[PDB]
């Protein structure tokens, strides 16, 4: 067990979607780390309700 | 900057109005309120207005990011 090495510490190497491990359009804010779609799926359940 | 002034204008006309009303008299309150509201400039009247929100697909409230078009 050796070699699989870089900065996996910053850069999107590191961070990915908690639901589906895709690595774009990522809701970093507010300690979510969902992909932007994985919001609208896991959104009502979270608490973000569309008001206005 | 500017707002702060019809704010302070409105305030020292309103305050002065509540002055002559509450303890002093009413006739002078009404002679004041007349002298003011014959030309308002929103002196005792709060300007009911406030800014619109922005909507997506535009720089301001209403206007829109220019349409590409072939």
């Amino acid at each position: 067990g050796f070699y699989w090495s870089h900065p996996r510490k910053f850069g999107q190497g590191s961070r990915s979607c908690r639901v589906c491990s895709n690595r774009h359009g990522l809701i970093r804010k507010y300690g979510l780390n969902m992909c932007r779609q994985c919001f609208r799926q896991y959104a009502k359940d979270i608490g973000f309700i569309k008001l206005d | 900057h500017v707002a702060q002034i019809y704010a302070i204008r409105q305030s020292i006309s309103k305050a002065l109005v509540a002055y002559y009303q509450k303890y002093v008299d009413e006739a002078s309150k009404k002679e004041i309120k007349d002298i003011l509201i014959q030309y308002d400039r929103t002196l005792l009247v709060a300007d009911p207005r406030r800014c619109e929100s922005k909507k997506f697909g535009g720089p301001g409230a209403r206007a829109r990011y220019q349409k590409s078009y072939r």
């Binding site: 507010y30 300690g31 896991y42 359940d45 | -």
Partner: protein, 227 residues
């Protein structure tokens, strides 16, 4: 430990934990008609009421399955030994929950059946149960290389407003078949408008109920009385 995670970043986290559950739970207690958890945090403890239907399967061998899921949630979201008790309960009037019936239709098709006779069997039921109205949509390829979309509807249904938000019981579920993939969409209308017990708002705001004259008898000559 001395983090004190933020009333911004914390309710987000418990919304997330909520979601993470309601998925594995859905995806594992599927054949048993999981309707929904309501997460029940307490002193020293985190209750979590698994509101599903056929509780003979959530218990299993003398109550094994319940004990697996308890251990799972212990081992995942960080709940120490004796700090999490699952509590499987049977759903009241399962006709009126959506995902119960929508799942009942993933598995009625999966089992091996036509669309037609099945979804009627659902739609029939959910109305007969006690619904203001309902609809079911079975989009997807359906005995043909092309995709159809089928929609069998019954009773009343509001299709706009805030009202929708606390009245309809929407539920999407896929279904993966020996061919490909259909969509179920069950969308039930709740008649808790009549009698929740205190049905939330009760009126659909359109609807006013004028209580009637009731008495208003007698003009007559004057008279008096004493007591």
């Amino acid at each position: 430990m001395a983090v004190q995670i933020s009333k911004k970043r914390k309710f987000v986290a418990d919304g997330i934990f909520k979601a993470e559950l309601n998925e594995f739970l859905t995806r594992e207690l599927a054949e048993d008609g999981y309707s929904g958890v309501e997460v029940r945090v307490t002193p020293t403890r985190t209750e979590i009421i698994i509101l599903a239907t056929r509780t003979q399967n959530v218990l299993g061998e003398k109550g094994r399955r319940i004990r697996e899921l308890t251990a799972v949630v212990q081992k995942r979201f960080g709940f120490p030994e004796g700090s999490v008790e699952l509590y499987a309960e049977k759903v009241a009037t399962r006709g009126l929950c959506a995902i119960a019936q929508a799942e009942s239709l993933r598995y009625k098709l999966l089992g091996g059946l036509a669309v037609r006779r099945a979804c009627y069997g659902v739609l029939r039921f959910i109305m007969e149960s006690g619904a203001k109205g309902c609809e079911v949509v079975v989009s997807g390829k359906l005995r043909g290389q092309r995709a159809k979309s089928m929609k069998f509807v019954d009773g009343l249904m509001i299709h706009s407003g805030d009202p929708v938000n606390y009245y309809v019981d929407t539920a999407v579920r896929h279904v993966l078949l020996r061919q490909g993939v259909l969509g179920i969409k069950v969308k039930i209308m709740l008649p808790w408008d009549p009698t929740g017990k205190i049905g939330p708002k009760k009126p659909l705001p359109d609807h006013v109920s004028i209580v009637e004259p009731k008495d208003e008898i007698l003009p007559t000559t004057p008279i008096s009385e004493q007591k």
